[PDB]
């Protein structure tokens, strides 16, 4: 063994190792319980950054947990390289999109094996081949025949910046994901898939997920946003039919989500293009006046019809209204109004002067009809009144019973309603998956017969910055019907990223697998990811996705599971400095912290930031998540080649707990670097004084006190760090318990031939709770040690017999009849066993209150007090 600590000789010889073996390479092995741990593959929009060390450490720490506790472990990497982040990347580096994704994703694989990642490489995967996208374009095909996706015009959400349509999910403060330009509305034809036909089952599934941070399932539900109303329908009076357009002569309907306070409904409104409105102004010129000035924040306008329609629950007649807030195309275009407990009804009807039913009690409030307060809303403690039998019932109770008299009458049945909108796939963009479409005008938007699958995506463009550049291709986009046989048109927009995201998981259970999506004695054993980590940016964007796509597909047969990812860790960000210059174009052009000199106030202030190569200023933007996007990342290779991996991945698990945000710092990767060279110096050490021995191991009786103690040590950090590792997932902890190990190991006497024998299990067992993180050093340290191989050792077990306390049960007697017995430390002094024998509730009790006269102690054996 060498003294020195030289990672650059062993980092390479220990992944070596592991790569001849071919431990990392894993099959479908009935003989092992399995075990899929996956991180969130990587965007190839620029290098990888310490941000992504600690997402990726995380990930292998507990891959290589599980693999030294004997299960067949898969850990797959592969690249999420189909759409925006890759292309924008090409753009601004001014690379052809192809180009740029397959040397970014060499250089992103050789930072990821420089780190010694336990990694299945060939389950590798890149999302832009037509290996892989070919079968997200055969399930695009099978779901549009099916409705489940389907093309229509609409208002869509439009990114000026990066010239394309975006999908609900991808607009972030009215941003879009990527530009951070403000987004514009317009009317564009897109591709959607229904994911409100599941909208009720992801929403409820989200109740199985016990081990996903309950914020992840909340803004989840969130934008799911069910909502449980009612349609109501009021019958148009007698004296109110003039104009019979069908129903719309026999009953008006409405939704709303109060229906416990329907017997507080005081009048009706309706929009200026509903019938009603059409009807009350075949004769009122005034009528259409308000029709054609209508035709959230907008004050409220309004006016009365005459025409009536009736409470189906008490018979009240209500007078109809037109209204400015009431959109033709929101359900069915009309609603009611209670307005003693409706914020937006009371503000109406005080001024246009309609009455206020108070219909809801909320304990000892007192209601005031002209002063609104937010008790009237209350959703939670209200209890009806004036609501005939539905009084006194609560919320959830009245909601049942109006559903029971209004379905008895026949006028109204409960329906549910959702904030989610379907997802908007397609984008006017040349890097992305093509659409399996063909528009013939004859037979309409055919799709591509699975037999012609893939739609070749050409890698040889580079995109113009002016529109969809597959649209200036007649080349792809001319060709034949596959119905006709005529003359036809390709789709030319292509797949949003987020396609590909959405079942990568899958693809992994066999990644060559040319008959399907993914093959089925693979799922059957893969079954879900066993654990997940990602940030928790992808709360809705993407982890939403996922889990309707794993739906689609067990729905197509395809897999068996309901949900993809069982556990989901949402790692704390990596943050550090942030810079930026404002471009010509009104885009930022980010700048790295490496390339900025700054200049500081007496005080310590950075008050000036100048870039080095021109000596021209940069904006001082503040500490900010570690992004490739943002050019502020740290390269791991850069560390690697200074200090180790080892010491890169010792650093990202010590600084902070796995979800607590971690500011860079230069004194944390030193402080990682002296532990390292510890742990290499007390293992050296250790040898030189002797060489090896067989690790203690055993029955203890006879080892010193002082050696005991150590081995309670040993076995109670294998106990908590087998704890951190397995049930709280807390990293760093685990390393501080075996510090703290080595702590009192140097303050042992271990020279002896029965120390030597501990200090080989004490130093046995460290490196093997440490190789999760750091393996590459404790590859080396154990093969110094120990002659078999560390993987083979398996998990350190916890001896149970060193955790008992040493101790000793003393008698004490008063007057020399045994009047008592006490357990105190085999170490304890004589006083210690008199201070206890006087603490005895028997002695105390024996002695009565004389003072003892004197008491004699038999050298752990017995204490006389003589009283
Ligand atoms: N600063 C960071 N700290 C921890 N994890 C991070 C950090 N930055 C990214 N990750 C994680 O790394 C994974 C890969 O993300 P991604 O490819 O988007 O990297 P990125 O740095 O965010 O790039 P981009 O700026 O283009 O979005 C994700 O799971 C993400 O949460
Ligand atoms: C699973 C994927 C959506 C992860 C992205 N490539 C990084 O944010
Ligand atoms: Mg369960
Ligand atoms: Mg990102
Ligand atoms: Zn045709």
Redesign the pocket.
Known sequence: MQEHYQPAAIEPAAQKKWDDARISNVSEDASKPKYYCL?????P??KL?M??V??YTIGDVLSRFKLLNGFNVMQPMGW?AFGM?AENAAMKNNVAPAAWTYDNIEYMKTQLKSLGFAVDWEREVATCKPEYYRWEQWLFTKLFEKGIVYRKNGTVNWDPVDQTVLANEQVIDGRGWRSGALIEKREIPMYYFKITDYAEELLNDLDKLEHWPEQVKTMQRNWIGKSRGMTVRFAVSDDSKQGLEGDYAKFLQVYTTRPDTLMGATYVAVAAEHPLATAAAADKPELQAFIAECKATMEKKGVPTGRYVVNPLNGDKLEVWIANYVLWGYGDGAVMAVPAHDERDFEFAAKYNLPKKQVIAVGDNAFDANRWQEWYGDKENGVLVNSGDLDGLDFQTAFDAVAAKLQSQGAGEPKTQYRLRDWGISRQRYWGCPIPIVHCEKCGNVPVPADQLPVVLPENVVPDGMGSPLAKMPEFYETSCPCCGGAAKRETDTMDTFIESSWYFFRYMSPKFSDGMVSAESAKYWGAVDQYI??I??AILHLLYARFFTKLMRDEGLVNVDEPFERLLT?????CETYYRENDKGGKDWINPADVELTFDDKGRPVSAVLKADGLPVVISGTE??????NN?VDPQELINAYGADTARLFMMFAAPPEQSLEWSDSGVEGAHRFLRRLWRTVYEYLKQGGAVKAFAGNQDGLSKELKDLRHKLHSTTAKVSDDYGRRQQFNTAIAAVMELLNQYDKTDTGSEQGRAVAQEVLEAAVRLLWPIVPHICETLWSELNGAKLWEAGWPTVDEAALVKSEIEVMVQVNGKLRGKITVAADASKADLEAAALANEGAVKFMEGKPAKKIIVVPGRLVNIVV
């Not at 998540?625 to 943002?630: A, D, E, R």
């Open positions: 991180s969130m593959f990587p965007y929009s620029g950054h941000g992504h600690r997402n999420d982040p990602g940030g940016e992808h790692q704390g960000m990596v943050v998540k570690m992004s490739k996007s943002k990342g």
